[PDB]
Amino acid sequence: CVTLECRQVNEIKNCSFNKVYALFYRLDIVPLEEERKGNSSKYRLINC
Amino acid sequence: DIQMTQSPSSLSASVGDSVTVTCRASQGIDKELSWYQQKPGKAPTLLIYAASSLQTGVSSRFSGSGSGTDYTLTISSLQPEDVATYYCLQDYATPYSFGQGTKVEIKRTVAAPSVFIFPPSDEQLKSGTASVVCLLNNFYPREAKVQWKVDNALQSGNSQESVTEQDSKDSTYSLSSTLTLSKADYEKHKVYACEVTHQGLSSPVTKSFNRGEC
Amino acid sequence: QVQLQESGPGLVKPSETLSLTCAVSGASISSNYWSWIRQPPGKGLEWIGRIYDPTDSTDYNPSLESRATISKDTSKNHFSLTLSSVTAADTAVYFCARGLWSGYFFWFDVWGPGVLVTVSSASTKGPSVFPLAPGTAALGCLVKDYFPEPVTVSWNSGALTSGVHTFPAVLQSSGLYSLSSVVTVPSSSLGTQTYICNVNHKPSNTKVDKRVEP
Ligand SMILES: *[C@@H]1O[C@H](CO)[C@@H](O)[C@H](O)[C@H]1NC(C)=O
Ligand code: NA
């Protein structure tokens, strides 16, 4: 299902889905890889 | 990059002492820190992985503390099995950077070395070169002086020393010193001895061989 | 039950490419981080890079300057590393290790034993092993004139471990390594028991057993 690419938004993280960037909540996304603090991390929705 | 600095570089403590290793980052790393144990000759093994959380099977004696930049590893009751170098690692940001290590050794009671001398092989003497090994078996502290006297002539530039790492159970060290000569020089002289000075010995013990003694 | 094993030539001519592979057992390469870590002799730990299959991601330490490549083979469940244009700075013991993760947290929970890779122009040479023949009595096996490291020595194919001190190798003026493996035994046992040392120096494809008798 849809793959997200979130970073901290400067509880909620600023994501991208595949050229549009959508803002999400920490709880409804699920880490696919190790989360990185400064840069981006790839998540996937709790819906799948 | 994030620089990682452990302190101290080295430390010696008595069995049952409490010892703390410090590891300081150059930025806050939000407890993204893991501690590893590396006994001599082995690969490291994990101890603690999120500043605080102890790995299953690891002893309750190992505890992990810290926040921000400053992090500690505390060994509640230093056991003799804990002879190792200990490594911190930050996973806050790639490239993940290790600490430079902290070597932990045991301060134990004085133990006099058992000394042994070994003549060259006849198998080896037919090679044109002869090696004589003088062995200090299980002693502490690591400091020792091993002189070579051939025909009671002190020798210098001739020999090479080697020391084992601290023992896992004994808390002792072993030391090799091998003197290497031609087979021409070896047979041109009579008695070969090594004299061993050590804190555990009243006086320098010497053990010797005479060429063809048996 | 989960274990890792590095395999590869322990000798690489400089300006050429190191190649190692880590075979993995008791776990599938498809679900966690698999990384390489190296450790130059008598120095600390440097993370080389990791690989990860859920997001098909590799990270590299910039210190390798893009000379490092990490390949995954889900077919045989082993992952490999290559390091090009090697120099003596790449002489180190290379560990493969599995990296677990949770949230922002990461750690190496299991490591391979590690393989030493000497970067040198020289060609391999196999050792010659001569005995050190002998209450408590010492005997040993002198393993002289080999290159490169390492040499592994066992006694009675593993049946004898308590009391053995295989010394760290010493490098002679010839650029050849040498070492001794000794053991203390009851002289009760001197007349009854046979004592053989099992020297293994695989960079030269050499295996020799020598009995140390009086
Ligand atoms: C959020 O998402 C996009 C990433 O391209 C970026 O343009 C924007 O500056 C970000 N801003 C905040 C407040 O998160
Ligand atoms: Na992390």
Residue numbers in the entry:
A (entry chain C): 126 to 135, 153 to 160, 171 to 186, 186A, 186B, 186C, 186D, 187 to 196
B (entry chain L): 1 to 214
C (entry chain H): 1 to 52, 52A, 53 to 82, 82A, 82B, 82C, 83 to 100, 100A, ...
Provide passages from the article that reported this PDB entry.
Crystals of D15.SD7, D19.PA8 and VD20.5A4 with the scaffolded 16055 V1V2-1FD6 were obtained and diffracted X-rays to resolution of 2.8 Å, 2.0 Å, and 2.8 Å, respectively. The V1V2 structure adopts the same conformation as seen in the 16055 NFL trimer (RMSD of 0.9 Å, 0.6 Å, and 0.8 Å over 44, 39, and 41 Cα atoms, respectively), confirming that these antibodies recognize an epitope elicited by the trimer and that likely no induced-fit conformational changes were induced by the antibodies binding to the scaffolded V1V2 compared to the trimer. Additionally, the 1FD6 scaffold was mostly disordered in the D19.PA8 and VD20.5A4 complex structures. Indeed, VD20.5A4 is the most potent mAb but showed the least amount of BSA upon binding its epitope, indicating that in this case, precise targeting with a smaller epitope footprint might be relevant to potency. Finally, both heavy and light chains are similarly involved in the interactions, except for D15.SD7 and VD20.5A4 which use primarily the heavy chain (57% and 78% of the total BSA of the paratope, respectively), with the CDRH3 accounting for 56% and 50% of the total BSA of the paratope and 98% and 64% of the heavy chain BSA, respectively. While the epitope is overall positively charged, the paratopes showed different electrostatics, with VD20.5A4 being strongly negatively charged towards the center of its paratope. It appears that the paratope electrostatic of VD20.5A4 is more compatible with the overall positively charged epitope, which could explain its increased potency. Our analysis suggests that D11A.B5, D15.SD7 and D19.PA8 mAbs approaches the V2 region with a similar angle (122–126°) from the side (lateral) while VD20.5A4 approaches the 16055 NFL trimer slightly from above (~114°) and rotated compared to the other mAbs. No glycans appear to clash with trimer recognition by the VD20.5A4 antibody, which is in agreement with its slightly different angle of approach and smaller epitope footprint. Of interest, VD20.5A4, which showed a smaller epitope footprint by targeting the epitope slightly more vertically than laterally compared to the others, also avoided most of the surrounding N-linked glycans.
